[PDB]
Ligand binder design. Sequence first.
Ligand SMILES: O=P(O)(O)O[C@@H]1[C@H](O)[C@H](O)[C@@H](OP(=O)(O)O)[C@H](OP(=O)(O)O)[C@H]1O
Length: 502
Amino acid sequence: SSFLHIGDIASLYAEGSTNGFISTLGLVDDRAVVQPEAGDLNNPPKKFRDALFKLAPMNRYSAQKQFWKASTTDAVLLNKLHHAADLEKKQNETENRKLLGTVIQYGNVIQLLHLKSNKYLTVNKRLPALLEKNAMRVTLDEAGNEGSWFYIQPFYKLRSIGDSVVIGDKVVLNPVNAGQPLHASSHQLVDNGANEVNSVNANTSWKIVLFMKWSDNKDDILKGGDVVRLFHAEQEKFLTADEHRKKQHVFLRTTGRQSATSATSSKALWEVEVVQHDPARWNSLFRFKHLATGHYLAAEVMVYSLVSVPEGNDISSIFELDPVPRNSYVRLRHLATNTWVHSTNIPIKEEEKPVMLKIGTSPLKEDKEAFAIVPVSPAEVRDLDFANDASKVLGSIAGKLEKGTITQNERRSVTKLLEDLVYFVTGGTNSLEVVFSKPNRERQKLMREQNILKQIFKLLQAPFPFRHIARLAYRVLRHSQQDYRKNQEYIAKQFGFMQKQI
Ligand SMILES: O=P(O)(O)O[C@@H]1[C@H](O)[C@H](O)[C@@H](OP(=O)(O)O)[C@H](OP(=O)(O)O)[C@H]1O
């Protein structure tokens, strides 16, 4: 019939006493859950981009595990030991590419890679779980290890070991050595209607719901869920979505640089929706979800004009393309109205020499009004993500301590976070006993444009114990303004509202 393969991207739907898709709480918190009322089979989850896993072959963790004994006075042995762990780490890559597309058989030993987080689902053999007492702590480690090996074995005996894994099949994922099989909990988390998944012998069956077949040539083809910017040919501007006069507007943004492709911005990024029937994987139609906010793109009331819509369902949010390949230069057409996108010069307004030029549409098909489908790096997408996290972590904490007390569990994570931010913004140099400390521009223009910095200030403040909070945030500030003349101006203005207490 139809089988599962190495490379297929699927979701895993629990079918025990608790049901749900496995998912993360983000790129800050390394825990795995089934949010049961978030989505079923019939009604798929809202942020279903987070319940997607790739099926990976068995990874090699021998020389890499050796190297994780940094028990040594000697340096050359350490450089010896690492060189292996890097050779091995690349030997995996070589081989896993060969095993691409091969049918998984029951009782092979695959790893399950989380797409959105890019971490490996992992049993930690020598731990308790956090919410459940007996069960082992299943986490998401980045590089993986021996406890990320899983025997994929059949739940009901309708099929058996050796037999090829068909789509939909209920399986038990069982760790190779790490002990007990994966199990979706009966315990809701303290903070989130979210059940903690862990490793303990229980009668949970995992439904394998295929999303995208192992045929997604990239970066080679535009397919659903790619993140791209839409640059303008003639106007030389990126399609952007932000607010003006408290109103969300879609526009081409005016730049003041000597390079048009350099004007890169997070608010310019869009997720692709290669429209399907069942929620799954050049002749059919597309919807553009604004990677920052979550709202989609549509043209309503030139007969029409492009603006954001809060939900991507209405037949307005759907577009068509005209000359699919990566980095294509297309002319896009609005379906429900049959019109060709067009850019204007009347901007939005109160500003002196503004930047937000309005975009509408026209029944006349042009030639110059072409948009470049500039592919965004997957890493950059995760930077928006690992930063959006920081905004909502401090979103709760700076709200929680602004009107009372926080728990002893919260300090330990925000202090952790404010350490992670230091490790991020300097492109993984700084952190403690340092050696060097040199900044990163992407993350800077991201500390700001995603309001990490806005949070920091609305955190320090207790208006009308800290030895590792303030001025820890101020060391983060100290980093994010480095040689950055625009961020300097921002932190100077933000410090203007900060002193306003007196
Ligand atoms: O180097 P400076 O003079 O301090 O200012 C930077 C740059 O020269 C532009 O003014 C601006 O890009 P735009 O022209 O596109 O606004 C940019 O913002 P960005 O780096 O956040 O894009 C600033 O950081």
